[PDB]
Design a binder for this molecule. Structure first.
Ligand SMILES: N[C@@H](CCC(=O)O)C(=O)O
Ligand SMILES: [Mg+2]
Length: 468
RNA sequence: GGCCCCAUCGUCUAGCGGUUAGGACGCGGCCCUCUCAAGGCCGAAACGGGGGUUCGAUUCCCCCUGGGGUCACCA
């Protein structure tokens, strides 16, 4: 059938490029009733960041993907972490040795650098070491690596399902290291051994791996295995069109979650990086995307990741996709983080409802509506000025307000409309200064709902401190 | 620099020989309105250049230019 996989390297924060590629793998697998695997590719102890693995696994789940096999969900072809499969690569590297498809090389990293400086790349000089001598030097413990013995001269065909066939000249393919001197495999060796053993049939990955594909075609040949299909997705880009990077863009999934972007929205945006619905619709579910996915609709240009459009979309989910109650639940962590509390569920829900069309990220909610949860709020200069100018009519309104028995948004509107009328002034002349009194801002939701929200007592108490 | 991939508004894109080249973000204007938003309407904004194929290129081919990727005992 169809088996796909995402194979993150635990060497930094959970990367958006990873979610992006994971998203297309997951969809292609489901669209085909196949399997979607997670394989942790921790073969480089130097760049290994302890804790990175858990973080990428949590971020994929957070984003909404599920995998069928992996480190924390089991599966028949585990382990799913390459550091625990060392003996396997070891074994396969040696089998290549016997088949005549690899050779041992003993140069120190220093000699290699020098070789590279003189000829710009390893010259395969170790191919000339007599096999029996190489074997003996190995038994004596002399440190070495095992390299791919590329067939020279020659030609190697790679087929990418989206771009067609590309024919590399073997002179462009290096005699790559397959097993390092510390006994760890390089990415090239492990990737082929594990995709095979875990049965992957469809390799969907970022374009940055395209030129390394001919090295993999050869390894599959060397082992006598059937190569899988290859689909290379365009790289996500920084605004300057270079591959998205930590210094020109936000590439950490943790940053996005911390900033209050909903996983559903981030996920919906990533689908738009290379894919589009037939009918041109832009807001759709994870499930709908799976059902409509087709490689015929994947475009190959490198998409600039636009934060502004992501925010637009996040605001769109907040106001049109999630329910009022869902938004209220998700806003809690940010209120907590801001050190604010809500009196009750009822209160929080109404507050979130009044602000729904005014925040594009969950983090923005506590910021723009701080006055709705604490007395410790800021009063802007423009608001303070509007307040001062309207103090006279506010003082004249106060008594009429402490008299209003029915504190409702309809009652209050009628009360204030009349007062402005009887005062021959425009409602705004009375609404704006009151808004400033109640919120310390001139940019808020409707005055009547703002006035109704806290109840007569709390409202006047605040109005009073302003008239003080 | 060698090799490889890519090419429609500033950005994400629709288009698979004939369209007033469409949508979305962002930008501007208007409407709504107690502020700010949200929403609605209108608007400005693209086929990189040169050859060919063809009755007819945004679309098929070549070159160029442009952009990107890749050349580690990193992934
Ligand atoms: N570990 C590789 C895996 C890429 C692949 O072959 O899918 C990475 O950087 O994601
Ligand atoms: Mg136009």
């Amino acid at each position: 059938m169809v088996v796909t996989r995402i194979a993150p390297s635990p060497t930094g924060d959970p990367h958006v490029g990873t979610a992006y590629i994971a998203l297309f793998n997951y969809a292609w697998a489901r669209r085909n009733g196949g399997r979607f695997i997670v394989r942790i590719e921790d073969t480089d102890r130097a760049r290994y960041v302890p804790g990175a693995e858990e973080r990428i696994l949590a971020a994929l789940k957070w984003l909404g993907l599920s995998y069928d096999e992996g480190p924390d969900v089991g599966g028949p072809h585990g382990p799913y972490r390459q550091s625990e499969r060392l003996p396997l690569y070891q074994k396969y590297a040696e089998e290549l040795l016997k088949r005549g498809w690899a050779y041992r090389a003993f140069e120190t990293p220093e000699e290699l650098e020098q070789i590279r400086k003189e000829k710009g790349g390893y010259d395969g000089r170790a191919r000339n070491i007599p096999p029996e001598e190489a074997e003996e030097r190995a038994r004596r413990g002399e440190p070495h690596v095992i390299r791919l013995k590329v067939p020279r001269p020659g030609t190697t065909e790679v087929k990418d399902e989206l771009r067609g066939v590309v024919v590399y000249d073997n002179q462009e393919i290096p005699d790559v290291v397959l097993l390092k001197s510390d006994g760890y495999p390089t990415y090239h060796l492990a990737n082929v051994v594990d995709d095979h053993l875990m049965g992957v049939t469809d390799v969907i990955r970022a374009e940055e791996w395209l030129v390394s594909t001919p090295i993999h075609v050869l390894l599959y040949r060397a082992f006598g295995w059937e190569a899988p299909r290859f689909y290379h997705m365009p790289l996500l880009r920084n605004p300057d069109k270079t591959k998205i990077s930590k210094r020109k863009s936000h590439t950490s999934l943790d940053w996005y979650k911390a900033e209050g972007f909903l996983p559903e929205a981030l996920r919906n945006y990533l689908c738009l990086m290379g894919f589009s619905m037939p009918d041109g619709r832009e807001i759709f579910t994870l499930e709908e995307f799976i059902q409509a996915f087709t490689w015929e609709r994947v475009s190959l240009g490198g998409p600039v990741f636009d934060l502004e459009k992501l925010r637009w979309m996040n605001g769109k989910y907040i106001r049109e996709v999630l329910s009022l109650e869902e938004v209220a639940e998700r806003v809690k962590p940010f209120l907590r983080e801001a050190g604010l509390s809500w009196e009750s569920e009822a209160y929080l829900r109404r507050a979130v409802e009044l602000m729904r069309p005014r925040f594009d990220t969950l983090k923005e909610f506590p910021e723009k509506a701080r006055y709705l949860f604490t007395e410790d709020y800021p009063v802007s200069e423009k608001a303070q000025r509007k307040l001062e100018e309207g103090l006279p009519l506010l003082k004249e309104l106060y008594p009429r307000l402490r008299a209003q028995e029915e504190w409702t948004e309809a009652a209050l509107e009628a009360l204030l409309r009349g007062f402005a009328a009887e005062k021959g002034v425009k409602l705004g002349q009375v609404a704006q200064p009151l808004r400033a009194a109640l919120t310390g801002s001139l940019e808020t939701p409707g005055l009547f709902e703002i006035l109704a929200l806290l109840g007569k007592e709390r409202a006047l108490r605040r109005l009073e401190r302003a008239l003080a």
